[PDB]
Each structure stands twice: as C-alpha cells, then as structure tokens.
Amino acid sequence: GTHNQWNKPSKPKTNMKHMAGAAAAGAVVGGLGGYMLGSAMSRPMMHFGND
Amino acid sequence: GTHNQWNKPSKPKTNMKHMAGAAAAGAVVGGLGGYMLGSAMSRPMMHFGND
Amino acid sequence: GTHNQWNKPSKPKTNMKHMAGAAAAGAVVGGLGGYMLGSAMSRPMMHFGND
Amino acid sequence: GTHNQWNKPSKPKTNMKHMAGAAAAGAVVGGLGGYMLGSAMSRPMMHFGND
Amino acid sequence: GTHNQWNKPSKPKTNMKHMAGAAAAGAVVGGLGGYMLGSAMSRPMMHFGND
Amino acid sequence: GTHNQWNKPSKPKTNMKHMAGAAAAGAVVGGLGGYMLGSAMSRPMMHFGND
Amino acid sequence: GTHNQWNKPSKPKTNMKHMAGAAAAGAVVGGLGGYMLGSAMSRPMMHFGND
Amino acid sequence: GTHNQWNKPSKPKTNMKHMAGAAAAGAVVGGLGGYMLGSAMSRPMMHFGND
Amino acid sequence: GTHNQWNKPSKPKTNMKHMAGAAAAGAVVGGLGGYMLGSAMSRPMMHFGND
Amino acid sequence: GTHNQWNKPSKPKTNMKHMAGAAAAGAVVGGLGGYMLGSAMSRPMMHFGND
Amino acid sequence: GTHNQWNKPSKPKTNMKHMAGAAAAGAVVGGLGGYMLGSAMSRPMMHFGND
Amino acid sequence: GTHNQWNKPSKPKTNMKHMAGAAAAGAVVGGLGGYMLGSAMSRPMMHFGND
Amino acid sequence: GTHNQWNKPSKPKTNMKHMAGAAAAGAVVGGLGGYMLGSAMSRPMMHFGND
Amino acid sequence: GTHNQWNKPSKPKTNMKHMAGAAAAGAVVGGLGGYMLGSAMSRPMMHFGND
Amino acid sequence: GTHNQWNKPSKPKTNMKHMAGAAAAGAVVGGLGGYMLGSAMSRPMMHFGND
Amino acid sequence: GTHNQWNKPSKPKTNMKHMAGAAAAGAVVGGLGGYMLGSAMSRPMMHFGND
Amino acid sequence: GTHNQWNKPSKPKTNMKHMAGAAAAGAVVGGLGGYMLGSAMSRPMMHFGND
Amino acid sequence: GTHNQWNKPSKPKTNMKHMAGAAAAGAVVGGLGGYMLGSAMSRPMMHFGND
Amino acid sequence: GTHNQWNKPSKPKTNMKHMAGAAAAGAVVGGLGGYMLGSAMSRPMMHFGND
Amino acid sequence: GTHNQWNKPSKPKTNMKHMAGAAAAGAVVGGLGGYMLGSAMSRPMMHFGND
C-alpha cells in the first residue's frame, strides 16, 4: 500500500550536542603477572563537555 | 492499506543533549596473577556534562 | 485498512537531556589470582550531568 | 478497519531528562582466588544528575 | 470497525524526569574462593538525582 | 463496532518524576567458598531522588 | 507500493556538536610481567569540548 | 514501487563541529617485562575543542 | 522502481569543522624489557582545535 | 529502474576545516631493552588548529 | 578474647553458578507525552542460563 | 571469652546455583501523559535458569 | 584479642561461573514526545550463558 | 591484637568465568520528539557466553 | 597489631575468562527530532565468548 | 604494626583471557533532525572471542 | 610499620590474552540534518580474537 | 617504615597478547547535512587477532 | 623509609605481542553537505595480527 | 629514604612484537560539498602482522 508523509515545519531548529553512540571508561589495574613494590592507580576520565 | 501522516509544526525546536546510547564505567582491580606490596586503586569517571 | 494521523502542533519544543540507553558502573576487585599485601579499591563513577 | 487520529496541540513542550533505559551499579569484591592481606573495597556510583 | 480519536490539548506541557526502565544496585562480596586476611566491603550507590 | 474518543483538555500539565519500572538492591555476602579472617559487609543503596 | 514524502521546512538550522560514534578511555596498569619498585599511574582523559 | 521525495528548504544552515567517528585514549603502563626503579606514568589526553 | 528526489534549497550553508574519522591517543610506558633507574612518563595530546 | 535527482541550490557555501581522516598521537617510552639512569619522557602533540 | 578456627577440609569443591547480586527487568511503556497511532510493546528478558 | 571452632569435613561439596540477592520484574504501562490510539503491552520476564 | 585461622584444604577446586554483581534489562518505549504512526517495540535480552 | 592466617592448600584450582561486575541492556524507543511513519524497534542483546 | 599470612599452595592454577568490569548494550531509537518515513531499528549485541 | 606475607606457590599458572575493564555497545538511530525516506538500522557487535 | 613479602614461586607462567582496558562499539545513524532517500546502516564490529 | 620484597621465581614465563589499552570502533552515518539518493553504510571492524 | 626489592628470576621469558595503547577504527559517512546520487560506504579495518 | 633494587636474571629473553602506541584507521566519505553521480567507498586497512 501507499505511504504518504507531508512535513511542513517552519523554522525548525534542532540541536544534537554532547552525545555519544557508545562510551566506555575502563581500567585493568594490579599485579598483572609482575612484581611491584608500589601503588598502581588508574583514573580514566571521560567528559562530554559542559553546554 | 494506505498510511497517511500530515505533520504541520510551526517553529519546532528540539534538543538532544548529554545523551549516550550505552555508557560503561568499569574497573578490574587486584593482584591479577602478580605479586604486589602496595595498594591498587582505580577510579574510572564518566561525565555527560553540565547543561 | 487505512491509517490517518493529522499532527498540528504550533511551536512544539522538546528536550531530551542527560539520558542513556544503558548505563553500567561495575567493578571486580580483589586478589584475582594474585598475591597482594595491600588494599585494592575501585570507585567507578558515572554522572549524567546537572541540568 | 480505518483508524484516525487528529492531534491538535498548541505550544506543547515536553521534557525527558535524567532518564535511563537500564542502569546497573554492581561490584564483585573479595579474594577471587587470590591471597590478600588487606582490605578490598569497591564503591561504584551512578548518578543521573540534579535537575 | 473504525477507531477515531480527537486530541485537542492547548499548551500541554509534560515532564519525564529522573526515571529508569530498570535499575539494579547489587554486590557480591566475600571470600569468593580466595584467602583474605582483611575486610571486604562494597557500597554500590545509584541515585536518580534531586529535582 | 466503532470506538470514538473526544479528548479536549485545556492546558494539561503532567509530571512523571522519580519513577522506575523495576528496581532491585541486593547483596550476596559471606564466605562464598573462600577463607576469610575478616568482616565482609555490603551496603547497596538505591535512591530515586528528592523532589 | 509507492512512498511519497513532501519536506517543506523554511530556514531549518541544525547543529551536531561535540559528538562521537564511539569513545573509549581505558588503561592497563601494573606489573605487566616486570619488576617495578615504584608507582605506576595512568590518567587517560577524553573531553568532547565545552559548548 | 516508486519512491518520491520533495525537499524544499529555504536557507538551511547545518553545522557539524567537534565530532569523531571513533575516539580512543588508552595507555598500557607498568613493568612490561623490564626492571624499573622509578615511577611510570602516562596521561594521554584527547580534546575535541571548545565551541 | 523509479526513485526521484527534488532538492530545492536556497542559500544552504554547511560547516564541517574540527572533525576526525578516527582519533587515537595512546601510550605504552614502562620497563619494556630494559633496566631503568628513572621515571618514564608519556603525555600524548590530541586537540581538534577551538572554534 | 531509473534514478533522478534535481539539485537546485542558490549560493550554497560549504566549509570543511580542521578535519582528518585518521589521527594518531602515540608514544612508546621506557627501557626498551637498554640501560638508562635517567628519565625518559615523550609528549607527542597533535593540533587541528583554531578556527 | 581470642578467637580460633581450625579448618581442615579434604578436597572441598564449591560451585557458584548462575547467580546475581541484584537483577531487574523493567519496562516503562505507553504514550509518555507523545502522540502514537500504534501499539507500543516491550519485552525485556533476563535469563541466568541453564545449568 | 575465648571462642573455638574445629571444622573437620572430609570432601565437602557445596553448590549455590540459580540464586539472586534481589530480583525485580516490573512494568509501568499506560497513557503516561500521552495520546495513544493503540494497545500498550509489556511482558518483562526474568528466569533463573533450569538446573 | 588475637584471631587465628588454620586453613588446611587439600585440592580445593572452586568455580564461579555465569554470575553478575548487578544486572538490568530495561526499556522505555512509547511516544516520548513525538508523533508516530507505527508500532514501537523493544526487546532487550540479557543472558548469563548455559553451563 | 594480632591476626594470623595459615593457608595450606595443595593444588587449588579456581575458575572465574562469564562474570560481570555490572551489566545493563537497555533501550529508549519511540518518537523522541520526531515525526515517524514507521516502526521503531530495538533489540539490545547481552550474552555472557556458553561454558 | 601484627598481621601474618602464610600462603603455601602447591600448583595453584587460576582462570579468569570472559569477564567484564562493566558491560552496557544500549540503544536510543526513534524520530529523535527528525522526519522519517521508514523503520528505525537497532540491535546492539555484546558477547563474552564461548568457553 | 608489622605486616608479613609468605607466598610459597610451586608452579602457579594463571590465565586472564577475554576480559575487559569496561565494554559498551550502543547505537543512536533515527531521524536525528533530518528527513529520511528509508530505514535506518545499526547493529554494533562486540565479541570477546571464543576460548 | 614494616611490611615484608616473601615471594617464592617456582616456574610461574602467567597469560594475559585478548583483554582490553575499555572497549566501545557505537554508531550514530540517521538523517543527521540531511535529506536521504535511502537506507543508512552501520555495523561496527569489535572482536578480541579466538584463543 | 621499611618495605621489603623478596622475589624468587625460577623460570617465570609471562605472555601479554592481543590486548589494548582502549579500543573504539564507531561510525557516524547518514545525511550529515547533504542530499543523498542512495544508501550510506559503514562497517568499521576491529580485530585483536587469533591466538 | 627504606624500600628494598630482591629480584631473582632464572631464565624469565616475557612476550608482549599484538598490543596497542589505543586503537580506533571509525568512519563518518553520508552526504556531508554534498549532493550524491550513489551509495557511500566505508569499511575501515584494523587487525592486530594472528599469533 | 634509600631505594635499592637487586636484579639478578639469568638468560632473560624478552619480545615486543606487532605493537603500536596508537593506531587509527578512519575514513570520511560522502558528498563533502560536491556533486557526485557515483559511489564513494573507502577501505582503510591497518594490519600489525602475523607472528
């Protein structure tokens, strides 16, 4: 069957800001098979921005 | 059968902000098969932004 | 059968903000097969943003 | 059979804010097969944002 | 049979805020097959935001 | 048979806030097959937000 | 069947800003099979920009 | 079947700014099979630019 | 079947700025099979430019 | 089937600025099989330019 | 006061399978402030696995 | 006062399977502030697995 | 006071399989402030795996 | 006070497989402020793997 | 006070396979402020692997 | 106070395979402010590998 | 206070394979402010490799 | 206070293979402000390699 | 305070193969402000190599 | 305070093969402000090599 769409906007303004399809902020920390005499830290940061 | 849609907006303004399809903030911490004499910390941060 | 829709909004403004399809903030902490003489901590943070 | 819908809003404003399809904040803590002489803590935080 | 709906709102404003389809805040804590001489704690927090 | 609905609201304002389809805050604590000489605690918190 | 679309916007202005198809900020830290007498830290930062 | 589209915008202005198809900011830090008597840090930064 | 598109914009102005198909900012730091008595740091920066 | 496109823009002005197909800013730092009694640092910078 | 525990198992085998700290399968369906001339269904499924 | 426990099991085998700390299967269905001319259904299923 | 634990297992084998700290499978379906002349369905599935 | 732990396992074999700290499979479907004359479906699947 | 741990395993073999700190599989589908005369579907799949 | 750990394993073999700190597979599909007379689908797949 | 660790493994073999700190597979599909008379699909695949 | 670590492995062999600090496979597809009478597809693949 | 580490491995062999600090495989496809009467596809592949 | 490290390996052999600090394989395809009556494809391949 037929499909009809009449789109009549006047001055449509559309914003897509600070968006992501997929975002991952991970960390694998620790000995990982080695010999460490210190602290292992990891701070991955992800920021989509302000305004 | 037929399908009809009449769309008549006047000045429609649409905002999509600070949005994600999928967001993951994970961490795997600890010995992980190694020999550590210290602290292992991990602070993954994810922020979608203010306004 | 036929399907008809008449959409007549005047100045419709729509906001989608600070939203996620799926959000996960997890952590796997501990010995994980290793030999640790310290504390293992993990603080994954996820924030959708203020306003 | 036919289906008809007449939508006549005037200035409809709609907000979707701070919403998630699915949100999970979990943690698996403890020895996990390893030998630890310290505390293992984990504080995953998830925040949808204020206003 | 036919189905008809006449929708005539004037200035309808609708808010969906701080809502989730499914929310889970869990934790699996303890020895988990390992040998620990310390405390294992876990405080997963989930917050939908104030206003 | 036919079904008719006439919807005539004037300035309808609707709020859905701090709501979840399903919410779970659980914890599995204890030895879990391991050997622990300390306390295992777990305090999963879920908060839908104030106002 | 036929498909028809009439698009009649007047002065439509559309913005896509600060967006990513996929974003990852990860880190693998620790002994990694080596012998370290110091701290190993890693702070990968990703920022989508302000406004 | 036939497909028809009539596009009639008048002065459409479109902006794509500060966007990436895929962005990765990672780091692999630690002994990596070597013998280090110092700290190994790594701070990969990625910035999409302000406005 | 036939496909027809009538494109009638008047003064369309389009901007693509500060965008990348794929961006990677990584670093592999540490002993890497050698003998170091100092700190190894690495700060790869990638910037898409302001405005 | 036939495909037809009528493109009628009047004064279309298009800008592509500060864009890259693929951008990589990496660094491999550390002993790398050698004997160093100093710090090895590396700061690769990539900048797409302001405006 | 003193606390003593003598644990002498011989070949203890322990299984933790198909378990979750917290599981939620929810759905928010319906108009949600919009104008729909069709059915909205949602069937979120969660399965812990067979054996 | 002193507390003593002598645990002498021989070949203790323990199974924890198909268990959850907290399980929720909910659904919020209906108009939810919108105008629908169709059925809204929702069938969230949760299954802990067979054997 | 003193705390003593003697752990003497012989060939202890421990399995943790198909387990999650927190699992959420949610969906928000419906008009969501838009004008749809079709069905919106959503079937998020989560599976912990068989054996 | 003093804390002592004697761990004497002989051939302990421990498996952690198909496990996640936090898992989320969500979907936000529907008009989302737009004008659609078709079905919008979404089937996010998450699988922890068989055996 | 002093803390002592004697770890004496003989041939301990430990496996961590198919595990994630945090996993998210989400999708935001629908009009998203645009005018579509077709179906929008999205099937994000995440698989931790078999054995 | 002093902390002592005696680690005496003989032939310990440890495997970490097919694991991620954080994994996200998302998709944002639909009109996104544009005028489409076709189907928009998106199937992001993530696989941790078999064995 | 003093901290002492005696690590005495004999032939320890450790494998880290097919692992990522953070993995993201996303896609943003649809009109994106343009006028399309065709299908827009996107299938980003990420694979950690078999064995 | 003093910190001491005695590492005495005999023939330790360690493998790190097919691993990434951060991996992203994304795609932004669609009109992107242009006028297309064809299909736009994009299949970014990332593979960590078999064995 | 003093820090001491005695590293005594005999024939340690360490492999780092097929690894990346950060990997990105992205694509931006579509009209991009132009007028196309054909299909635009893009298949960026990244492979870390087999064995 | 003093820091001391005694490294005594005998015949240590270390391999770093097929590794990159940062790898990017991207593509920007489409009209890009031009008028094309053909297909624009792009297949950037990056391979780290087999063994």
Burial class (CB in 10 A: 0-12, 13-18, 19+), R8: middle
Nearest to S41 by CA among Q38, T41, R37: T41
Query: Solving technique for this entry?
Result: cryo-EM
Q: Residue D14 in contact with residue E35, Cβ under 8 Å?
A: no
Residue I34 to residue H32: CA distance in whole angstroms? 9
Buried/exposed code over G11-46 (b: 16+ C-beta within 10 A; e: otherwise):
bbbbbbbbbbbbbbbbbbbbbbbbbbbbbbbbbbbb
CA N1 to chain centre: 40
Residue C28 to residue C25: CA distance in whole angstroms? 11
Chain-chain contact of E36 with F32 (C-beta, under 8 angstroms): no
Q: Residue R17 in contact with residue Q49, Cβ under 8 Å?
A: no
**Who's near C24: CB < 8 A, 6+ residues apart?**
B23, B24, B25, B26, D23, D24, D25, D26, M24, N22, N23, N24, O22, O23, O24, P22, P24
- Chain P hits for G16, CB-CB cut-off 8 Å, are 32-33
Residue N16 to residue N38: CA distance in whole angstroms? 45
Burial class (CB in 10 A: 0-12, 13-18, 19+), F42: buried
* Residue B13 contacts N, CB cutoff 8 Å: no
Residue E38 to residue N5: CA distance in whole angstroms? 11
Residue P23 to residue B23: CA distance in whole angstroms? 8
Residue E26 to residue M23: CA distance in whole angstroms? 8
* Parallel/antiparallel/unpaired status of strands C28-30 and G13-17: unpaired
Integer angstrom CA distances of residue E6 from C2, F6, F8, J30: 17, 5, 8, 72
Q: Residue O39 in contact with residue A9, Cβ under 8 Å?
A: no
The two tokens of residue L46 are 């949760």
Sheet holding G3-7, edge to edge: F3-7, E3-7, D3-7, C3-7, B3-7, A3-7, G3-7, H3-7, I3-7, J3-7
Chain-chain contact of O37 with G3 (C-beta, under 8 angstroms): yes
Full 3-state SS string of chain M: CCEEEEECCECCEEEEECCECCEEECCEEECCCCEECCCEEECCEEECCCC
Rounded to the nearest angstrom, the minimum Cα separation between P18 and chain O is 5
Chain gaps in chain I, named by the residue before each (C–N > 2.5 Å): none
CA L21 to chain centre: 6
Which single residue is written with the structure tokens 């670093």?
Answer: I27
Chain-chain contact of A36 with H48 (C-beta, under 8 angstroms): no
Nearest to B29 by CA among D47, A30, F4, S26: A30
P26 to chain R: closest CA residue: R26
- Chain S hits for J3, CB-CB cut-off 8 Å, are 37
Buried/exposed code over O16-28 (b: 16+ C-beta within 10 A; e: otherwise):
bbbbbbbbbbbbb
Residue Q30 to residue O32: CA distance in whole angstroms? 9
* Residue I10 contacts Q, CB cutoff 8 Å: no
Which single residue is written with the structure tokens 């630690």?
Answer: H30
Which single residue is written with the structure tokens 């203010």?
Answer: B50
Chain-chain contact of B28 with P14 (C-beta, under 8 angstroms): no
- Chain A hits for R5, CB-CB cut-off 8 Å, are 35, 37
- Chain M hits for E28, CB-CB cut-off 8 Å, are 19, 21
Of E14, E16, E24, the CB nearest to K24: E24
Residue O9 to residue P12: CA distance in whole angstroms? 8
Chain-chain contact of B22 with P26 (C-beta, under 8 angstroms): yes
**Who's near S1: CB < 8 A, 6+ residues apart?**
R1, R2, R3, T1
- Rounded to the nearest 10°, the torsion over CA D10, D11, D12, D18 is 180
Question: Which DSSP symbol is given to Q34?
Answer: S
Q: Side-chain half-sphere of M44: how many Cα atoms within 13 Å?
A: 39
Chain-chain contact of D35 with B31 (C-beta, under 8 angstroms): yes
Phi and psi for O45 in degrees, rounded to 5? -115, 135
The two tokens of residue A44 are 């991955």
- Chain R hits for B37, CB-CB cut-off 8 Å, are 3, 5
Cα of first residue to Cα of last residue in chain P, in angstroms, is 45
The two tokens of residue C10 are 């005047």
Q: Residue R39 in contact with residue Q40, Cβ under 8 Å?
A: yes
What's at I18, amino acid-wise?
H
What's at M27, amino acid-wise?
A
What's at Q7, amino acid-wise?
N
Question: Which DSSP symbol is given to O20?
Answer: B
- Chain G hits for P32, CB-CB cut-off 8 Å, are 16
CA J6 to chain centre: 35
Rounded to the nearest angstrom, the minimum Cα separation between E31 and chain M is 11
Q: Residue F26 in contact with residue D25, Cβ under 8 Å?
A: no
Q: What angle do CA O21, O26, O31 make, to 5 degrees?
A: 160
Chain N with chain P: Cβ pairs closer than 8 A: 11
The two tokens of residue M9 are 């297992």
Residue F5 to residue L31: CA distance in whole angstroms? 14
Other residues' Cβ atoms within 10 Å of the Cβ of residue F2:
9
Nearest to G28 by CA among P21, S30, D38: P21
Chain-chain contact of J10 with I11 (C-beta, under 8 angstroms): yes
- Rounded to the nearest 10°, the torsion over CA F7, F8, F9, F14 is 20
* Residue A38 contacts H, CB cutoff 8 Å: yes
Nearest to P19 by CA among Q19, C16, S29, T2: Q19
Nearest to S35 by CA among T27, J5, P39: J5
S21 to chain I: closest CA residue: I26
Between chain G and chain L, are at least 3 CB pairs below 8 A?
A: no
The two tokens of residue P40 are 């928009």
Chain-chain contact of R33 with I26 (C-beta, under 8 angstroms): no
* Residue B48 contacts Q, CB cutoff 8 Å: no
Buried/exposed code over I1-39 (b: 16+ C-beta within 10 A; e: otherwise):
eebbbbbbbbebbbbbbbbbbbbbbbbbbbbbbbbbbbb
Between chain H and chain J, are at least 3 CB pairs below 8 A?
A: yes
- Chain Q hits for O45, CB-CB cut-off 8 Å, are none
* Residue T38 contacts J, CB cutoff 8 Å: no
What's at M40, amino acid-wise?
A
* Parallel/antiparallel/unpaired status of strands R23-25 and Q23-25: parallel
Of P40, P44, P49, the CB nearest to R30: P40
Residue S38 to residue Q35: CA distance in whole angstroms? 14
**Who's near I3: CB < 8 A, 6+ residues apart?**
H2, H3, H4, J1, J2, J3, J4, Q37, R37
Of N40, N44, N49, the CB nearest to P30: N40
Integer angstrom CA distances of residue P2 from F46, G14, J41, R3, S6: 39, 65, 37, 10, 19
Nearest to I6 by CA among S29, G5, C38, Q32: G5
* Residue H26 contacts J, CB cutoff 8 Å: no
Q: Which residues pair with E23 in a beta bridge?
A: D23, F23
Question: Which DSSP symbol is given to L10?
Answer: B
Nearest to I7 by CA among H5, A5, J7: J7
Phi and psi for O32 in degrees, rounded to 5? 50, 45
Residue B26 to residue A27: CA distance in whole angstroms? 7
Q: What angle do CA F25, F29, F34 make, to 5 degrees?
A: 150
Which subunits sit against M, judged by 3+ Cβ pairs under 8 A? B, C, D, E, F, K, L, N, O
Which single residue is written with the structure tokens 């203020």?
Answer: C50
Residue O4 to residue D37: CA distance in whole angstroms? 8
Which subunits sit against D, judged by 3+ Cβ pairs under 8 A? B, C, E, F, K, L, M, N, O, P
* Parallel/antiparallel/unpaired status of strands T35-36 and S35-36: parallel
Residue P20 to residue Q19: CA distance in whole angstroms? 5
- Chain Q hits for G20, CB-CB cut-off 8 Å, are 26
Other residues' Cβ atoms within 10 Å of the Cβ of residue M10:
17
Residue R27 to residue R32: CA distance in whole angstroms? 12
CA C27 to chain centre: 16
- Rounded to the nearest 10°, the torsion over CA Q39, Q42, Q43, Q48 is 170
Of F14, F22, F23, the CB nearest to L33: F14
B28 to chain P: closest CA residue: P21
Q: Residue C7 in contact with residue D6, Cβ under 8 Å?
A: no
Which subunits sit against T, judged by 3+ Cβ pairs under 8 A? G, H, I, J, R, S
Residue C30 to residue C40: CA distance in whole angstroms? 6
Burial class (CB in 10 A: 0-12, 13-18, 19+), B11: middle
Which subunits sit against N, judged by 3+ Cβ pairs under 8 A? A, B, C, D, E, F, K, M, O, P
Cα of first residue to Cα of last residue in chain B, in angstroms, is 45
- Sign for the CA dihedral angle at N31, N35, N40, N46 comes to negative
The two tokens of residue P12 are 């310990």
3 state DSSP class of Q39:
coil
Nearest to R21 by CA among O15, A30, G42, I34: G42
Which subunits sit against G, judged by 3+ Cβ pairs under 8 A? A, B, H, I, O, P, Q, R, S, T
Nearest to E21 by CA among H31, N44, M13, G46: N44
* Residue B35 contacts G, CB cutoff 8 Å: yes
Q: Which residues pair with Q46 in a beta bridge?
A: P46, R46
Residue P5 to residue R6: CA distance in whole angstroms? 11
